[PDB]
Amino acid sequence: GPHMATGQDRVVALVDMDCFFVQVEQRQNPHLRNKPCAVVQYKSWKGGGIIAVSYEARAFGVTRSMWADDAKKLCPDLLLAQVRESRGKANLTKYREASVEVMEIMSRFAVIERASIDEAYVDLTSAVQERLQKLQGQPISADLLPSTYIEGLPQGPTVQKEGMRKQGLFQWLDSLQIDNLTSPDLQLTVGAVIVEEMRAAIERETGFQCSAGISHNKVLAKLACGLNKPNRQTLVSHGSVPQLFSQMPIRKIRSLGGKLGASVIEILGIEYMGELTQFTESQLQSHFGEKNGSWLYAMCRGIEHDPVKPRQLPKTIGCSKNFPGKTALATREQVQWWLLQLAQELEERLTKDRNDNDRVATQLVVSIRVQGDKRLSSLRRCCALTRYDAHKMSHDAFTVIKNCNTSGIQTEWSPPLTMLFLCATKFSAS
DNA sequence: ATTATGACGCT
DNA sequence: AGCGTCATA
Ligand SMILES: [Ca+2]
Ligand SMILES: [Mg+2]
Ligand SMILES: [Mg+2]
């Protein structure tokens, strides 16, 4: 009753760019705008691999991971933009730089946590309190929420999409009690107003559209964001959780999309997130461990406490390349040449990072994959990163992996290498 | 023969 | 430390 926490203490948003790499390319090349199009890397093997897809192209069934030649079978008029290649490898600089554009705008509104190249969590709790003070018991107009969906509404006693959206929003606003500044539902609504403003700022100042979720924690904000894409935002209230979770596959919740999620389904014999409520905390801890068990017990009730971390910059800077099938590296010279290529890109990015962000990396991590190994990484070794110099870094990387070479012949490398990875870690202020 | 990333947990 | 899991475009 009165002592039962409800996880309604914070307002958290998740902002995620729509078909991000595609929008970056469409901004640059107006011929690609409002067309079925995709971004691809490499070209020789089956037309290149697709890594991002416009919503127009998704209507034909085009997806990420598809070979472009195969995508063309579904969508013959598909337009393509290629990722830049430098030093023999895909170079993602343009997209990293576009990401910084967006993150810097978001940072004007609130503390953000960079969750990937195109998404960030926002802790709006303080901003909401401030806005509520300005408002002074003043009602919130639907006009302030022109692209917001309220999950679960409309309900109870129009056949068009926008019509339904407004009906739900009207029901929601009709109900609100703007008289109480501590009302969680009111707080979420003010959060959503701010996020409309944030999203408008992003589009005005970059040209990029995005979707967003607004809820009381990161997991629900992430889930909410995906409910209405593209170019829309969704508010998931605490009260919406039981119905939302009653038919929500477990795998849709962040962190449950893999083996742990599969085990929750198998061991408990359930399919939907809501079904978890019937287990005690101790039962869940017994199967999934102390940490996971407590997390699941709260999460299935819509409660999660993971904080929005104050971190706008990536914690590592890495460079990696696969060498699949027949392209695997089989000579020492090959291995050294490609380590150099990677190290040169890494040096370039590190030097820029040091100038922009007043920090220096202190550890170099070297990782490789050997032909036959099912695992993505076969081996990982670290050494000191004491100078931003590509020849030194490549020489040092070779030193830490050279003993992996089975070949009795110094000149030959066996088993051939199917991946190389250099990563700078452990930053210190500079 | 998806590839190129990046955060965090376990022991 | 080195390995594994889960996630991004
Ligand atoms: Ca996105
Ligand atoms: Mg994303
Ligand atoms: Mg995606």
Side-chain angles (χ1 to χ4, degrees):
Chain A
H3 312 296
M4 206 66 62
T6 58
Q8 283 172 297
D9 54 306
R10 294 179 293 158
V11 180
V12 175
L14 184 276
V15 180
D16 175 272
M17 307 307 295
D18 298 329
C19 52
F20 186 49
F21 288 13
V22 165
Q23 291 197 84
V24 177
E25 297 293 334
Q26 288 173 323
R27 184 175 70 171
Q28 189 185 314
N29 185 353
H31 282 138
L32 303 179
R33 300 178 181 183
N34 303 307
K35 293 278 166 44
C37 65
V39 174
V40 292
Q41 46 190 18
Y42 305 117
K43 210 78 181 72
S44 304
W45 187 267
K46 296 177 177 186
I50 292 172
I51 61 173
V53 186
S54 79
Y55 281 77
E56 295 87 344
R58 296 177 197 197
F60 290 86
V62 180
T63 67
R64 177 177 44 89
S65 86
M66 203 164 266
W67 298 116
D69 284 350
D70 292 334
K72 277 283 191 177
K73 303 174 183 163
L74 299 176
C75 182
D77 296 315
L78 183 66
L79 302 180
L80 298 174
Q82 292 181 250
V83 176
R84 174 180 180 176
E85 289 179 47
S86 302
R87 292 182 245 266
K89 64 182 293 302
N91 187 303
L92 306 170
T93 300
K94 186 194 304 183
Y95 316 107
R96 291 193 185 98
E97 289 176 352
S99 175
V100 169
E101 290 182 68
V102 172
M103 302 296 167
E104 290 185 349
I105 294 160
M106 278 181 302
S107 291
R108 300 206 307 262
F109 293 79
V111 170
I112 79 171
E113 179 183 342
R114 180 198 198 271
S116 75
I117 195 159
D118 88 325
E119 71 205 83
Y121 294 96
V122 192
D123 190 322
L124 297 162
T125 308
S126 57
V128 162
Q129 291 304 107
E130 295 184 13
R131 186 64 168 273
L132 274 171
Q133 290 301 346
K134 277 204 285 229
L135 267 36
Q136 291 302 68
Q138 179 175 355
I140 299 177
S141 165
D143 294 337
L144 300 182
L145 296 163
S147 65
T148 295
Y149 282 82
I150 309 298
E151 175 58 24
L153 297 179
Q155 139 216 294
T158 179
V159 298
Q160 60 187 6
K161 181 177 58 179
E162 172 68 7
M164 190 103 325
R165 182 197 72 85
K166 288 195 174 83
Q167 298 248 14
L169 179 63
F170 288 149
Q171 291 190 349
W172 174 257
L173 296 173
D174 281 343
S175 301
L176 281 183
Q177 187 51 260
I178 48 73
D179 183 31
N180 182 15
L181 281 63
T182 69
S183 172
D185 285 342
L186 176 57
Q187 292 170 343
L188 289 186
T189 304
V190 174
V193 168
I194 293 167
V195 176
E196 292 273 11
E197 292 164 358
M198 302 184 52
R199 290 178 51 245
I202 293 168
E203 187 176 5
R204 184 185 81 82
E205 299 173 32
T206 71
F208 303 142
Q209 291 180 353
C210 62
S211 295
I214 304 93
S215 196
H216 291 295
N217 57 62
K218 294 161 71 180
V219 164
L220 291 180
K222 176 67 181 310
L223 184 68
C225 185
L227 296 176
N228 295 279
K229 271 212 164 235
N231 198 31
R232 296 290 184 269
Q233 54 184 63
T234 304
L235 185 160
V236 165
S237 65
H238 183 68
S240 75
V241 173
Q243 292 209 73
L244 183 62
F245 277 13
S246 73
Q247 301 187 90
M248 183 67 64
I250 286 158
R251 63 180 178 273
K252 302 299 184 178
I253 288 62
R254 196 199 78 190
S255 85
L256 301 181
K259 296 177 179 186
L260 171 63
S263 74
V264 168
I265 291 163
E266 175 141 295
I267 291 174
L268 299 179
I270 61 177
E271 295 170 36
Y272 305 119
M273 196 67 187
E275 296 180 85
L276 282 165
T277 64
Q278 296 308 294
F279 301 95
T280 69
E281 190 173 1
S282 298
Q283 283 181 303
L284 297 174
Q285 288 175 324
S286 79
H287 297 294
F288 312 113
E290 181 183 319
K291 187 170 172 178
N292 284 333
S294 284
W295 184 88
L296 288 166
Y297 181 86
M299 191 72 250
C300 70
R301 295 165 166 77
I303 301 175
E304 208 225 356
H305 298 304
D306 186 36
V308 176
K309 295 183 175 188
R311 181 191 76 247
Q312 187 175 346
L313 304 169
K315 292 191 169 197
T316 57
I317 296 181
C319 292
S320 69
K321 189 167 174 49
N322 294 349
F323 302 94
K326 183 175 174 296
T327 72
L329 313 185
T331 78
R332 177 174 50 74
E333 291 292 357
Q334 259 189 312
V335 172
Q336 298 178 331
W337 188 80
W338 282 107
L339 284 173
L340 181 60
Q341 302 320 291
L342 285 177
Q344 290 175 357
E345 178 184 333
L346 185 59
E347 178 181 353
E348 185 180 5
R349 287 160 61 188
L350 285 170
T351 296
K352 177 65 145 53
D353 181 79
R354 190 182 63 205
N355 286 326
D356 291 345
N357 300 317
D358 298 313
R359 62 182 188 171
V360 291
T362 67
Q363 183 178 78
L364 181 65
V365 174
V366 187
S367 177
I368 66 178
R369 190 186 185 188
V370 297
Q371 199 154 53
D373 191 331
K374 179 184 177 302
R375 306 171 296 168
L376 278 59
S377 164
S378 297
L379 183 134
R380 203 213 72 159
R381 292 292 190 263
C382 70
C383 65
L385 208 176
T386 63
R387 289 183 56 259
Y388 285 4
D389 183 285
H391 279 94
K392 173 169 177 54
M393 292 193 285
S394 64
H395 186 268
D396 288 347
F398 185 75
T399 293
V400 304
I401 74 167
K402 63 185 186 300
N403 63 323
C404 282
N405 184 9
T406 287
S407 177
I409 316 177
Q410 200 85 320
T411 303
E412 310 308 288
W413 196 286
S414 61
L417 297 186
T418 52
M419 182 275 294
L420 296 177
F421 186 15
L422 296 181
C423 186
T425 70
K426 298 193 184 310
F427 286 91
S428 301
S430 65

